Design a protein around this ligand. Structure first.
Ligand SMILES: [Zn+2]
Lengths: 8, 1684
């Protein structure tokens, strides 16, 4: 499952 | 008998009458006739019918015909006795012919004989007969004495000594002998007949004679004889009607005889003196003339005795006599005998005024000599003073003509001197009373009756009263007296009316300040009602001018005055139209800077437009053409001002509503040129007025000068400096015509400053001398003098700076800086300080060779260390002035009135212009230094300011600067957009661009303006840069050729324009230098392309052309000279590619397994000395690393210093600026650690010497400062072509008490070079970003796994293919003594195999890691170190490592990695050799020394004590984007003991500030680095006590844009003092970084006290599923940190 990046 | 003898005598008289050839015979016959006369006398001396007397008279006539006075005197010798015996009466005219005619004969005889003594004695006997029968003679006139007999005696004294200085004792006796025995005896008579006293006529003669004798004797220094003479008359003074006369004469003769004695003496005689006069007038028939003549003598005693010998009682005693004397004179005036012939009556009045003239003089004498205790005496004299003025005005009653005019003239003087005395000794109340009767008479008199009394006398008499009333508190009565002052001068010119008008406004303004409004209610119109309309209008205009002169708030007063004036002026008449237009211009000003439209229904623009139309409809006469010019010019100027004010207010609301870069189109319209046309027309009118030789006929030239000042300031704001120059020249002309030397000096100073800004120092020098000349006519106590002298000193300092006289210029600048007057709290002083700061920056931008070391310390000791600091302080002061003048609306749009009082108007536009100029300087300097972000901040602020004002020219300038900055950032799209905006502004200001292909001699807007020409050339430069960045070569080169052509051509146009404007004969000696920075930059860019294209021969000669240009202008274009020298050195090195041996090889002791170099070192040393003081980052780094390469191991310390000084230069500049801000607030609140850090990061803290001796000494001290146990390794890339990435690694190992060790590692020779590694890293990041978006889970995971494997391969390559054998330089040193001994042994044996530069320290360092020294590492080392005989060296090395293996163990220590902008990206900490070691990163070595300083003074609490685990602040899931992170971390974070923080909310900026300043740990488990709630500025404004554990994406990364040093938030944390900063080098995914964070926190916190964070950082690195893609991301910045 794709993980969201820790960015804005 | 006797009759017969008389008949014979008559015949003898005829015989004696003949004076022919026988005159001696006739004289002999006359002698016989005298005997015959004696014989006749025996019978009868004189016939009863006086026949003998008639015969004697005939004989006397015969003697007169024959000129025989002596014979006649003998003949008439017994006549007095014969007349005395004659008695009877009826003496005829013949009696006079024989007696008075004898005196007449004697008068002719006196006119004959040269001598006087004998002749005067004969005349005295003749005088005894001249008026002998005067008992019934007619009275004499009254310019003379009482009787003719005494008048004769005075006449003889006239022939005597006329000077009357002294009388000889013998002369006094001889002179007395004549009158006493001949004249006095005859009048007295031997038969005195005591029964019959002297007859009335006889008595008057007797006293008159005594006075004349005493007056002549006393005046001619003789008093003793007169004392006896008075006694003789006093002897016969039994009783008489003229008795008082001689008693008063006795007192007079006494007074001169007493002379200077005890004080009471003067009073005692004066006391008796009053009694004699007073009682005599009481008599029913007083001797009027007797008292009069006698009193005049007594007055002389005082007038000759007026030697300041006066007391209080003397003056009152004088007033007693003075008053009685006045009664006598007016009483004589009553008598009408002299009333008919006013000739004598006028003499009586002159005597009255002489009597009063004495009183005024005596009082002024007393007044001057008065002390505090004496003021009581001065007060008692008031009532006496009051009566004096009353008598004088009463005396004038009836006088007409010059008698009226003159005698009014005294009464004005006499009261004025009396009032001045009281005004002088602080007696205001009494002064008004003395001048009141005169003041009211002068006002009430029908205007014109007194048309000749000097205006000054009237002005003085009135001024004393108005001032006295003003200071007592009587402001109400003062205004009425002012009207009386104007009333008296009703028939007078307007010039005299100025002073009453000035006093009116002052009295009313003080009244208003006192709180009174009733006085304010009254205006001149109502009080002056009854005067003619024209004079009332003139007075109202003067009152308006006086109101415009005063400061503070006067808007509504001027509005009321303008309303009254407009009502008075009749609009139906053209003259009324002109007056209405002028008053409408005044109303336009008032409505322009106030809000009274609620009372007029008219705006400022409507009023000024109606004024302009009315003025256009005025056809003037022959004269009045000048006044019309002035009025129309002022109207045009104020129309411009009001339009600009409306535009500014509309812009304020535009921003307020919006609260851009879209309004740029709104700026430049046809309205811009239409608006500037008004200023052009005003200038044309003023030039036409003030150029012609004749002095202008304007009502107010001061207003013309002030308007000229306002026009010049507006022209500089709109960026039209030549027009401002013309206006300043006109101001100089006006100031010369107005005799104002302050204005002349200020104007000349402004011209000098303008000429210096343009770049022409000669014309500037000429204007500085005119200013110095004008300054010598001013009171040196005035602040204007001090200001102008300090300004002239600054201008002379700047001229010395320009003409390379730096030593004396620095001395002058230090004298100005140290002057206490520069710190005075006034707006003009603030404006002076700004130019001081700019000149300080000018001196601070100079190379160290220009000035001595001592003067450099003296200049830096003032407070500013870098030019940027001085410029920033100047900008801050300018903003403060703007705030103090016009609020904050023009600067920010988040209420104070403008308060226009003349100076504020000029200062407003001046300060706006200086803000824009200082912004330009700051932007240029900061962009040149490589600090693009700050420059962009200033550029945006200036663009906003020019947006509000709507000035297209300044907008174009700042848009070009912004385009240059965006090119520096490598942002091509935004730069192109800015350039296109510039193109539109330029094309619509003049109405491939069209301003190119213009004639060299062109007169268009873009060619007649230096500013627009500069903007065009900068545009071409930035466009060429864009073209070259986009790969379009030979187009950017074409544009650079255009720039090269354009700059010298434009300089000549400016030269010609300046010469034609100032009308100098010779041209400026040297062409101005303002486009020389543009030409130098073009030269630099063209030479750098020649480097890229070595074949183009054209570019090859450009390096020599540019170097000669920059060498001709030392030291002003030094940074460009340094760049050109670097390019020359690179050209001489040869091919910059191919990775050959390179000339540097000989200078290095290891190779991968005069001379040209001497010349290169010299050139590079010169360039380094050029830029060492204030270096641009990239150029400095290039020079430093190239010179380190060239120097090699020929000088280890120079190489290490050069490598150290090439890293993080922009951070050094920013730290210096930040430190200055900290010290400034420290001074404001109220520093030693701050001073030491300034001295550590400073560029000028060097001693004098030759390169590199002072640099090496500074480096040696900084190396002595290193702490123990720390290893500093600098990894820099040596770039052999600017704008590229080098493949040579410079490695410097710095340690305490060990010599520096350096090494060069060329990586181009091998595959997997440094460029390949960086390219692979960037590709990995790109692929990660692409994969993040994908939605298919399997593809996402597979791509992530591939990226992790790529990261592992890159990390392995870093250790094996880049550092190779030198990896051991980063490892700690051994404490065991084995490696030192082995190095000592091997050094000599290695030197015998060909080791060129034997270094024991390098051998020690490499032998410490003996265990991990692979056989291949040994082979590389031995083969590259001893190339002559490699195998023997390999054997020796293998033997040494065999002896050292196992027997050595690494120790506790710390590795600080200093990396450049390109290498900081790579994850060096994850290399397999560095996995088990504690490693952190610092921006530079000076930062490690700074950390040591802060820790010594106890400012870093966590680096001194430790991290408290209970002082943590966490920001979790602030934006509600991540639900998994919250679920994982919420329970752990909240259950932690003592931890506070937030979740699900953006923490208020106040919360993060307290977190960073008051806690020891800060954890951000969110997106990015948290720049949304805490930006770099906020963290920079605070001191960071806590350890920042930032777990976002790219938190520790530095962004490299173009060729600029990396920027980021971590740098701000380090500069704030963060003990340690943990962050992600690249972007991460949520769950993996969650596992890393959990592992790190659990491992560190569970460890307990004394737990190094770095150990658990590398252990937490093994937690994620993606080991290298996520674990390798976190890095540390700072120094190691533990738990307490
Ligand atoms: Zn042109």
């Amino acid at each position: 499952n794709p993980e969201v990046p820790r960015e804005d | 008998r006797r009759q017969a003898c008389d008949a014979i005598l008559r015949a003898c008289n005829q015989q004696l009458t003949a004076k022919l050839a026988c005159p001696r015979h006739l004289g002999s016959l006359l002698e016989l006739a005298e005997l015959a006369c004696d014989g006749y006398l025996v019978s009868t001396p004189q016939r009863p019918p006086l026949y003998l007397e008639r015969i004697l008279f005939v004989l006397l006539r015969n003697a007169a015909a024959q000129g025989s006075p002596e014979v006649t005197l003998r003949l008439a010798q017994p006549l007095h006795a014969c007349l005395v015996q004659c008695s009877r009466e009826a003496a005829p005219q013949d009696y006079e012919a024989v007696a008075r005619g004898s005196f007449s004969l004697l008068w002719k005889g006196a006119e004959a004989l040269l001598e006087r003594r004998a002749a005067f004695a004969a005349r005295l006997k003749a005088l005894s007969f001249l008026v002998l029968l005067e008992d019934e003679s007619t009275p004499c006139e009254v310019p003379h004495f009482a009787s003719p007999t005494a008048c004769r005696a005075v006449a003889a004294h006239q022939l005597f000594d006329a000077s009357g200085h002294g009388l000889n004792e013998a002369d006094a006796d001889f002179l007395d002998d004549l009158l006493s025995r001949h004249v006095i005896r005859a009048l007295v008579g031997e038969r005195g007949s005591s029964s019959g006293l002297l007859s009335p006529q006889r008595a008057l003669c007797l006293l008159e004679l005594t006075l004349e004798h005493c007056r002549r004797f006393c005046w001619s220094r003789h008093h003793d004889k007169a004392i006896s003479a008075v006694e003789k008359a006093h002897s016969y003074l039994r009783n008489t009607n003229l008795a008082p006369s001689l008693q008063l004469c006795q007192l007079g003769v006494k007074l001169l005889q007493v002379g200077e004695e005890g004080p009471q003496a003067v009073a005692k005689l004066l006391i008796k003196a009053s009694a004699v006069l007073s009682k005599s007038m009481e008599a029913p028939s007083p001797p009027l003339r007797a008292l009069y003549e006698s009193c005049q003598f007594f007055l002389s005693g005082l007038e000759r005795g007026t030697k300041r010998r006066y007391r209080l009682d003397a003056i009152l005693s004088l007033f007693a006599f003075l008053g009685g004397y006045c009664s006598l004179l007016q009483q004589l005036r009553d008598d009408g005998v002299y009333g008919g012939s006013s000739k004598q009556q006028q003499s009586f009045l002159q005597m009255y005024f002489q009597g009063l003239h004495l009183y005024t003089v005596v009082v002024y004498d007393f007044a001057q000599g008065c002390q505090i205790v004496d003021l009581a005496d001065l007060t008692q004299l008031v009532d006496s003073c009051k009566s004096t003025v009353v008598w004088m005005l009463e005396a004038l009653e009836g006088l007409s003509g010059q008698e009226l005019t003159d005698h009014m003239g005294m009464t004005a003087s006499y009261t004025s001197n009396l009032a001045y005395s009281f005004y002088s000794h602080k007696l205001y109340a009494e002064a008004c009373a003395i001048s009141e009767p005169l003041c009211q008479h002068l006002g009430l008199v029908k205007p014109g009756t007194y048309p000749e009394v000097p205006p000054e006398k009237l002005h003085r008499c009135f001024r004393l009263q108005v001032e006295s009333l003003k200071k007592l508190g009587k402001q109400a009565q003062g205004c009425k007296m002012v009207i009386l002052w104007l009333a008296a001068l009703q028939p007078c010119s307007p010039e005299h009316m100025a002073e009453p008008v000035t006093f009116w406004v002052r009295v009313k303004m003080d009244a208003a300040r006192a709180g009174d409004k009733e006085l304010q209610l009254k205006t001149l119109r109502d009080s002056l009602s009854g005067w003619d309309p024209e004079t009332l209008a003139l007075l109202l205009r003067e009152e308006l001018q006086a109101y415009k002169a005063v400061r503070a708030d006067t808007g509504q007063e001027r509005f009321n005055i303008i309303c009254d004036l407009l009502e008075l002026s009749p609009e139906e008449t053209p003259a009324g139209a002109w007056a209405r237009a002028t008053h409408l211009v005044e109303l336009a000003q008032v409505l322009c800077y106030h809000d009274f439209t609620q009372q007029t229904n008219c705006s400022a623009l409507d009023a000024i437009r109606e004024a302009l139309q009315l003025l256009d409809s005025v056809r003037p006469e022959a004269q009045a053409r000048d006044q019309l010019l002035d009025d129309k010019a002022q109207a045009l100027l104020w129309l411009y001002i009001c339009t600009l004010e409306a535009k500014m207010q509309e812009g304020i609301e535009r921003d307020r509503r919006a609260q851009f870069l879209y309004s740029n189109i709104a700026f430049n319209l046809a309205a811009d040129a239409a608006q500037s046309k008004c200023l052009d027309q005003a200038l044309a009118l003023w030039k036409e007025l003030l150029t012609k030789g004749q002095a202008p006929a304007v009502r107010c030239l001061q207003q013309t000068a002030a308007s000229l000042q306002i026009l010049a300031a507006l022209y500089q704001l709109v960026a039209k400096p030549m027009q401002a120059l013309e206006v300043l020249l006109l101001l100089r002309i006006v100031s010369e015509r107005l005799k104002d030397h302050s204005k002349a000096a200020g104007s000349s100073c402004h011209i000098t400053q303008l000429l210096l800004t343009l770049g022409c120092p000669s014309y500037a020098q000429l204007h500085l001398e005119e200013a110095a000349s004008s300054l010598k006519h001013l009171d040196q106590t005035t602040d204007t003098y001090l200001l102008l002298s300090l300004t002239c000193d600054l201008l002379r300092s700047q001229l010395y700076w320009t003409h390379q006289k730096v030593t004396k210029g620095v001395s002058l600048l230090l004298s100005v800086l140290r002057d206490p007057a520069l710190q005075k709290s006034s707006k003009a002083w603030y404006l002076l300080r700004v130019q001081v700061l700019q000149l300080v920056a000018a001196y601070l931008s100079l190379p160290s060779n220009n000035l001595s070391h001592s003067l450099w310390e003296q200049l830096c000791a003032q407070g500013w260390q870098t030019p940027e600091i001085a410029l920033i302080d100047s900008h801050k002061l300018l903003r403060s002035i703007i705030l103090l003048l016009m609020g904050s609306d023009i600067l920010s749009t988040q209420e104070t009135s403008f308060l226009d009082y003349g100076e504020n108007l000029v200062q407003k536009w001046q300060v706006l212009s200086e803000v824009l100029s200082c912004s330009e300087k700051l932007v240029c300097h900061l962009g040149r230094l490589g600090s693009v972000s700050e420059a962009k901040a200033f550029c945006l602020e200036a663009l906003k300011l020019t947006t509000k004002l709507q000035i297209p020219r300044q907008c174009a300038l700042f848009l070009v600067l912004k385009g240059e900055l965006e090119l520096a950032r490598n942002d091509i799209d935004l730069c192109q957009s800015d350039l296109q905006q510039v193109l539109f502004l330029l094309e619509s200001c003049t109405e491939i661009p069209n301003f190119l292909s213009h004639s060299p001699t062109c007169d268009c807007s873009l060619c007649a303006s230096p500013v627009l020409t500069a903007v065009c050339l900068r545009w071409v430069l930035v466009t060429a840069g864009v073209r070259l960045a986009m790969g379009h070569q030979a187009q950017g080169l074409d544009l650079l050729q255009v720039v090269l052509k354009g700059c010298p051509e434009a300089a000549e146009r400016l030269t010609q324009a300046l010469q034609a404007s100032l009308n100098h004969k010779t041209p400026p000696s040297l062409v101005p230098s303002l486009l020389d920075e543009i030409l130098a930059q073009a030269y630099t860019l063209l030479a750098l392309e020649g480097l890229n294209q070595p074949s183009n021969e054209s570019l090859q000669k450009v390096l020599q052309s540019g170097l000669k240009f920059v060498a001709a202008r030392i030291p002003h274009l030094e940074p460009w000279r340094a760049s050109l020298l670097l390019i020359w050195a690179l050209t001489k090195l040869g091919g910059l590619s191919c990775c050959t041996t390179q000339l540097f090889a000989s200078s290095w002791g290891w190779q991968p397994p005069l001379s040209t170099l001497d010349s290169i070192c010299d050139s590079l040393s010169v360039a380094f000395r050029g830029i060492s003081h204030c270096p641009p980052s990239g150029l400095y780094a290039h020079l430093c690393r190239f010179l380190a390469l060239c120097l090699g191991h020929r000088d280890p310390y120079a190489t290490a210093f050069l490598v150290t000084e090439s890293v993080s230069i922009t951070c050094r500049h920013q730290l210096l600026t930040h430190l200055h801000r900290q010290l400034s607030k420290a001074q404001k609140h109220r520093d030693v650690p701050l001073a030491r850090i300034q001295r550590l990061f400073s560029f000028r803290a060097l001693e004098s010497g030759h390169f590199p001796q002072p640099e090496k000494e500074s480096f040696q001290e900084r190396l002595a400062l290193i702490p123990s146990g720390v290893t500093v390794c600098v990894l820099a890339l040596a770039t052999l072509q600017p704008g590229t990435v080098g493949n040579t690694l410079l490695l410097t190992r710095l340690e305490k008490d060990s010599p520096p060790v350096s090494v060069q590692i060329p990586t181009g020779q091998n595959k997997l070079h440094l460029r390949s590694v960086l390219n692979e890293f960037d590709a990995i990041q790109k692929a990660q970003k692409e994969n993040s978006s994908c939605t298919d889970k399997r593809e996402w995971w597979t791509g992530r796994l591939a990226l992790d494997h790529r990261m592992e391969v890159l990390i392995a390559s870093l250790e094996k293919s880049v550092l190779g054998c030198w990896k051991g330089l980063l490892l700690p040193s051994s404490e065991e003594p084995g490696p030192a001994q082995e190095a000592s042994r091997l050094q000599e044996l290695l030197q015998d195999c060909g080791w060129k530069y034997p270094d024991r320290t390098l051998l020690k360092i490499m032998l410490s890691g003996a265990g991990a020294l692979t056989p291949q590492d040994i082979q590389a080392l031995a083969y590259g170190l001893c190339p002559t005989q490699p195998e023997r060296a390999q054997e020796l090395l293998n033997e040494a490592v065999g002896r050292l293996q196992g027997l050595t163990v690494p120790s506790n220590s710390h590795l600080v990695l200093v990396l450049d902008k390109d290498l900081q990206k790579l994850p060096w900490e994850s290399m397999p050799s560095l996995q088990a070691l504690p490693v952190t990163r610092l921006p530079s070595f000076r930062f490690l020394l700074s950390y040591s300083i802060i820790k010594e003074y106890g400012a870093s609490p966590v680096l001194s004590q430790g991290v408290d685990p209970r002082s943590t602040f966490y920001v979790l899931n602030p934006h509600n984007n991540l639900s998994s992170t919250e679920e994982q971390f919420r329970a752990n974070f909240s259950s932690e003991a003592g931890w506070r923080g937030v979740v699900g909310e953006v923490p208020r900026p106040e919360q993060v500030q307290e977190a960073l300043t008051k806690h020891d740990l800060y954890i951000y488990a969110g997106h990015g680095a948290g720049a949304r709630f805490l930006d770099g500025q906020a963290v920079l404004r605070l001191s960071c006590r806590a350890v920042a554990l930032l777990f976002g994406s790219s938190s520790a990364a530095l962004a490299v844009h173009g060729n600029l040093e990396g920027a980021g938030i971590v740098l701000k944390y380090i500069m704030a003092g963060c003990p340690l900063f943990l962050g992600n080098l690249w972007d991460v995914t949520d769950r993996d970084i969650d596992r890393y964070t959990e592992a790190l926190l659990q491992g560190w916190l569970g460890a307990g006290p004394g737990a190094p964070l770095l150990y658990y950082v590398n252990q937490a690195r093994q937690a994620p599923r993606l080991k290298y893609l996520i674990g390798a991301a976190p890095i540390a910045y700072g120094l190691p940190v533990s738990l307490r």
